Amino acid sequence: VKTEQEDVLAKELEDVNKWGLHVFRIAELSGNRPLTVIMHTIFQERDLLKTFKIPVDTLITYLMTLEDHYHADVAYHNNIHAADVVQSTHVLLSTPALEAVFTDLEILAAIFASAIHDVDHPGVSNQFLINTNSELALMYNDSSVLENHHLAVGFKLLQEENCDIFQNLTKKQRQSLRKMVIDIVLATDMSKHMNLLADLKTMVETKKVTSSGVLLLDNYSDRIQVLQNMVHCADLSNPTKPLQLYRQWTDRIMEEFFRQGDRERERGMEISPMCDKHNASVEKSQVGFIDYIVHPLWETWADLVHPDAQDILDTLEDNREWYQSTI
Ligand SMILES: C=COC(=O)N1CCc2c(sc(NC(=O)Cc3cccs3)c2C(=O)OC2CCCC2)C1
Ligand SMILES: [Zn+2]
Ligand SMILES: [Zn+2]
Numbered sequence: 001v002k003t004e005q006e007d008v009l010a011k012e013l014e015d016v017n018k019w020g021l022h023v024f025r026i027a028e029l030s031g032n033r034p035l036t037v038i039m040h041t042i043f044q045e046r047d048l049l050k051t052f053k054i055p056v057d058t059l060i061t062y063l064m065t066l067e068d069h070y071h072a073d074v075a076y077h078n079n080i081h082a083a084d085v086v087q088s089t090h091v092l093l094s095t096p097a098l099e100a101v102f103t104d105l106e107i108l109a110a111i112f113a114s115a116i117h118d119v120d121h122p123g124v125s126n127q128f129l130i131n132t133n134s135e136l137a138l139m140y141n142d143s144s145v146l147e148n149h150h151l152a153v154g155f156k157l158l159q160e161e162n163c164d165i166f167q168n169l170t171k172k173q174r175q176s177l178r179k180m181v182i183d184i185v186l187a188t189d190m191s192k193h194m195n196l197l198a199d200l201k202t203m204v205e206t207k208k209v210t211s212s213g214v215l216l217l218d219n220y221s222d223r224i225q226v227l228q229n230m231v232h233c234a235d236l237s238n239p240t241k242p243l244q245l246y247r248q249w250t251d252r253i254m255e256e257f258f259r260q261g262d263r264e265r266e267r268g269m270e271i272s273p274m275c276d277k278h279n280a281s282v283e284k285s286q287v288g289f290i291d292y293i294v295h296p297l298w299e300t301w302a303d304l305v306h307p308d309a310q311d312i313l314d315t316l317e318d319n320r321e322w323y324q325s326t327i
Pocket of ligand 2: 117118188189
């Protein structure tokens with residue numbers, strides 16, 4: 001049946017539930033369809049198609065349309081980053097401390113929010129978009145420009161021919177899913193980070209647990225804050241991956257940043273915070289970024305789900321000392 005390529009692909013996909021799936025191999029084996037194949041795999045794996053009556057050809061058609069609205073000419077914020085965050089969100093949902101906590105609708109909404117979360121990303125920043133006085137910035141009034149755009153595009157794509165994967169959800173299911181997907185994606189904006197991180201801490205502070213090992217989340221605010229933190233954790237999971245992956249990701253985001261620095265030079269604009277080709281030390285930037293943003297976030301999350309995130313925290317801590325070695 002399968003081509004031998006499909007077979008090689010299938011064996012790699014046997015790792016979808018493991019942290020550090022080789023997402024870059026999967027992109028190669030798949031003809032640059034990492035997003036399509038990982039989503040499909042997860043959806044079958046989690047039985048999402050039957051539970052929500054999603055016709056499989058519609059699912060495929062939409063996945064492929066979604067992936068083609070990621071830019072192949074963008075080093076980091078592309079389909080592979082999309083697939084990576086989706087699969088990471090998928091692993092985090094399986095964490096033992098959230099066993100049987102979230103409904104299928106909420107799972108569906110977290111995975112879907114991951115898949116569309118950066119779609120149509122240009123490879124430059126909100127501030128850049130605001131400074132260039134770009135259309136996108138005028139539309140969204142300089143407020144969460146890219147993140148508002150990813151949502152509008154992710155949803156509009158469901159209207160293309162044979163693309164409505166939510167065609168069989170009730171109005172009720174659709175309105176709740178939508179709101180969940182909008183809260184999750186707007187929370188990927190980095191300027192929400194501290195606020196998001198603070199609530200997580202407060203969650204951990206006042207943390208309750210009941211009847212067997214399972215977190216007690218009994219109102220919307222609490223349930224959505226967790227999902228929001230989960231996906232935002234997945235968005236910032238590169239330095240917790242095995243170093244081979246992490247280094248490939250660091251390569252890509254640095255390429256994107258310098259290329260924006262270039263576009264800022266090519267327009268007299270002033271330079272971005274360490275987007276400086278020629279003048280910015282990657283090794284240092286990684287270390288501070290871990291100590292100030294990535295470690296605190298993941299340290300809290302580890303707290304929340306203690307101790308299922310131990311190896312994760314540990315890898316991050318190693319990758320951090322490894323970047324220090326590089327002075
Ligand atoms: C103090 C707040 O600053 C702040 O949030 N930003 C500046 C730095 C930075 C992001 S996102 C990101 N990277 C990721 O979202 C995913 C990763 C890809 C490879 C490692 S991590 C980096 C970064 O990693 O590097 C920067 C730090 C200073 C120079 C660039 C946004
Ligand atoms: Zn983003
Ligand atoms: Zn992202």
